[PDB]
Amino acid sequence: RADEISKIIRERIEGYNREVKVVNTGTVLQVGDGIARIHGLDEVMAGELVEFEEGTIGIALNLESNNVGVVLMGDGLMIQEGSSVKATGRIAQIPVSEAYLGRVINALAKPIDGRGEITASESRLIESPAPGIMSRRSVYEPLQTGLIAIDAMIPVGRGQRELIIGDRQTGKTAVATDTILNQQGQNVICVYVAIGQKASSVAQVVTNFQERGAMEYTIVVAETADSPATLQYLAPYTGAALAEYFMYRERHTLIIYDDLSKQAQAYRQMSLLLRRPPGREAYPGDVFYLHSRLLERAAKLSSLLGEGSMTALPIVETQAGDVSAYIPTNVISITDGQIFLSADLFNAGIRPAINVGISVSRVGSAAQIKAMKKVAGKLKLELAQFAELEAFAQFASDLDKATQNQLARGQRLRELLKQPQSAPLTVEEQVMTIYTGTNGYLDSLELDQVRKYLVELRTYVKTNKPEFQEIISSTKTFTEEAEALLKEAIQEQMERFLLQ
Amino acid sequence: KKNLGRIAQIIGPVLDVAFPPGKMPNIYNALIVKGRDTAGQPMNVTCEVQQLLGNNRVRAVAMSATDGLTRGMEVIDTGAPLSVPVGGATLGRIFNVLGEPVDNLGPVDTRTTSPIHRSAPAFTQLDTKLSIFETGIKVVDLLAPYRRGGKIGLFGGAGVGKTVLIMELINNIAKAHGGVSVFGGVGERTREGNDLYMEMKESGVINEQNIAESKVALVYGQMNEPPGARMRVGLTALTMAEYFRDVNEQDVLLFIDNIFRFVQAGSEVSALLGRMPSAVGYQPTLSTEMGSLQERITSTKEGSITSIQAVYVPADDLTDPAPATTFAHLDATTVLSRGLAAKGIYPAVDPLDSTSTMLQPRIVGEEHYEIAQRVKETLQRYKELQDIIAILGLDELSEEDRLTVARARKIERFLSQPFFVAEVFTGSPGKYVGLAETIRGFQLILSGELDSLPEQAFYLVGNIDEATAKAMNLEMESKL
């Protein structure tokens, strides 16, 4: 017991062998609540961590002529400023293995749940370059998200990089976790990081995960506002290394960057404290370098490099409903698609808010499944028609049938777009939904009861036609007997529900 | 210690210590000066250690007044970073940021001191048993329910609310609350805090004849401070709460005024600390110590700290970075839009942006949730039709929109509340409301039963039955 601990002590002090190598060292000039400057260090490289005298670890950013600035990875109390500090030589790796699944950590990937030490054998450089264009490929695998419109209008594929730029406090974290819970089915290990939230929020979110069973296969790297600036500056890099490493172990992956606006805010904070001369809107020039090196790290592999899929779904929220703010206009200039989750669109009652106006996709429809084209092209047309001719609704009473019927179908499709908080609705739940929406098998109904009609619809048919489930899951293509069985179930369920 | 410091360059409210090069203290350590004054030298001003400029000169901001100080005047170091006397001794006394009582009674014992700078609590120790507490103010109770133990976000311009709201909130929930409280007074007006202390005396919650009966402690960083005090009175209120969380193990509701004063004091001093200007003009290290102050306030299975932050957005410019950070910090946010109280809809909480994370139907009793989403949709319809009603006249639009505008107008006028201290602005007596009472009231309004009454009948109402009394009074006084 304790004597075995003493013999562990004995084997470790015999493992101490007096290794005599050269260590770079220097003295503390000034510390400044995040910034520390020391002089007398040449052979330190760029972006290298050192270790101080007290035990506080710090990383070096600017190698100035006279001194060298090191920024702090913790609490800067016991700095003595006249004491000596030494160098390390490592490039700030993080140890890694499988056992992080369901664990929560700091930016150093060191555990904070107290659920034991993660048995991490392998490791990885943080500042890894992205995979090249030759390792990159196209996108075939559809990513599922469970939501009607964003399964529908801007679909997302395993491999590509979709972005959501909803405004202040309107439902971004919600729909992110709904994608997570929608990935209960497949083998994909999503990667959740939460930056700059309160700890109570992220604890509430991970307890929601504990309830839904996501903790068997999720990973949370939550770096709340308590931590110093460098930790939140490099935390999404750590999450990215986790993603890319496990993608190199041939697994399917996605990531949820939380508030790259907070990332960039922390970056301009620590950098301007470090006397990096400020550039546009007081952010230094390499903020785009940061976000590009973070986001475009995610890609789709080469199918001889293992065919892992990495999909970047980050979040940036913008001050008071803007497009022309700095880092949002940067990240739309860099990434493929965008999604506008607007505040008044939420407050109007659309659950949840999707502007289907300026929301465009570079990949467009190329990542949807084969049945999704058939169910969705007519949907795209109908949404364009309602979004254009919508304002006539105030006298669609007076208008003719060709606009009137079409406006009624458009608005009840907007009511179809409503979906509750965290209802995991995969592909077979929604292809029938969009199918009866575009076939008009419910347009006799009025403008409220359609939601309960649809939930009774999908429950009954999900219990009634497991062969429909199978031919959805196997073909991913609407055959005519599938659509026949579909309309049969529609007539039966519509009959029963109409009779109540 | 034995480092007899020397003062080198007095730069406004920011000064500096020349030290013997061997021994210098560390960050946030106290530095008490041997200051003089208008007669003698019984002057003692503290200084906080921010950063040390290399060759035996440091950067330090004085808390108290920076007048009458010479270069080379000696300072005294401590080694204890400002251990502030918080225990059961502090109850019912207005304290200073130096841990000094200002209410001209005797000094209490300083056995229970604790340093103002410390580690934020760990992640895993974090009590999440999510439940709401009620107030009796309809427009936040119906709309954006207040999580017990979380944080409450009160944003508003200068003169739209935020003072009678917090006065009514202490007036209700302190006497409703078995645990003790703390009001920090960080940079509000000295008259209003004085009047709060008078109100507290009148309420008997202090019982100024007795210290141990008093359920509150007071700290006032008023406007007379140099900003070194104005950036630390917030954390003094923090450690006053923190002793009551840890060492007292009882739940404490927490009342703070404008944190924007605190962060703008940081913006005031970061120019002269030897740091640089930032985004739009604040301090660079905004969110770091902002989130320090935040995440040092939470509920961790030993006591509950519900908290109300009255952060002042300047001139309704919501693009501001510190309230932008605080937006993600908080739990229940209420913006107090000026255009409402410009129309006199007291209190002027916007029904559109305001929310909580407590809007889970599976925590709020789903009929309540249906009600709230329905009425928010209704107000959204009104505000979006605001563009064309001043263009197309009242009766261009359809008749469903007509009754929609009418009923929405009635409900937004029904958003009033005669508070029990609003009488110095209304004169009508203060009125207390329920919760299920208001639920039934708003369902009976928006369902359209009393959808014929005068629009002034539903104004300054306790509830809808009170509104029916005012409706019959109005239809008496209208004919005569």
Binding site: A320 | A315, D316, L318, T319
Partner: peptide, 12 residues
């Protein structure tokens, strides 16, 4: 901002 947000309101 205060104008520019309000000018966004006016444009919309």
């Amino acid at each position: 901002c205060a104008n520019l947000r309000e000018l966004r309101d006016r444009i919309g």
